[PDB]
């Protein structure tokens, strides 16, 4: 058992999974929570308990629940919590509670069972499982308040990026698109499935922030209460058509596609709430984080990134069309000079988000 520190938290790690590379992911949520201020929060699959402990130590959260089905994880969670908080951690039948400035509840159980027990209870639930969050999504949608916030992470990008299409159909009920656009399509597929599962509870969603980073997909959504809100949310779903010989894409808004070779359904709405993300960059700067440098770099990229469906990958398009292309920086400058919005995107190093029509983009990249 070794001792490590992440952010303001000090924890013991061996078993029980801990990935320091995920400290950035936790920094992001910590930043977000300092803006949204949810009172009652849940770290659904805690492992070492690092996420919930940081929520308690670094955000306005008042009641923090930590849960894990593993006995080893549960034992370690209790130890780590007491390593960061004083008081009496009262335990009884797989549940230990500390009632200090902040109330900490450590639970030993299947996340689905815990969330089923806490119906419409949490202001924020963070689902961060090993791989797919789909076996826990429906219950989380019932456990969060009707105007709650849901944080979802998908680690296995094989199905979301199109490598494992059959698995994507089974888990996400959507047809994935492989290639240069997969990081974004996978991200929109994730948002889209959350929106679809939420509708039956007469709930809609507003995307707070959704992004891709080092082979993992992240989506933060705000639940909207109302059948009509559910209807308007489903109206933001759509499909993508992609020409393999040109890199040109087409969008079709609608619950169902009307032409062959459609990809989706995917969320065609915003992937970020401009205001909040702008605030996040500022909040991140004024906060001591575990990976501050990386956090600011990602948040600034997303903050300045044009929020529009898809993008054009200069490299991939060059290979598809069999043409030579100019550099990304040069292309963006050229597009802006022609009066179009154009920015880089965190989804790909050679991708350019732009309001410009495909043909205008091609004429501009032609070297």
Q: What does it look like?
A:
By secondary structure, the protein is an alpha+beta fold. It has two domains: 1-308, Rossmann fold, CATH 3.40.50.150; 309-367, N2,N2-dimethylguanosine tRNA methyltransferase, C-terminal domain (Phenylalanyl-tRNA Synthetase, Chain B, domain 1), CATH 3.30.56.70. It has 14 helices and 17 strands. A nine-stranded mixed beta sheet has the order 5-6-7-4-3-8-9-11-10, sandwiched between helices. Strands 13-12-14 form a three-stranded antiparallel beta sheet. Strands 15-17-16 form a three-stranded antiparallel beta sheet. Helix 1 (23-36) packs parallel to helix 2, helix 1 crosses helix 10 and helix 1 crosses helix 11 (292-304). The chain is globular. Keywords: Methyltransferase, RNA-binding, S-adenosyl-L-methionine, Transferase, tRNA processing, tRNA-binding. Its EC number is 2.1.1.216. GO terms for molecular function: tRNA (guanine(26)-N2)-dimethyltransferase activity; tRNA binding.
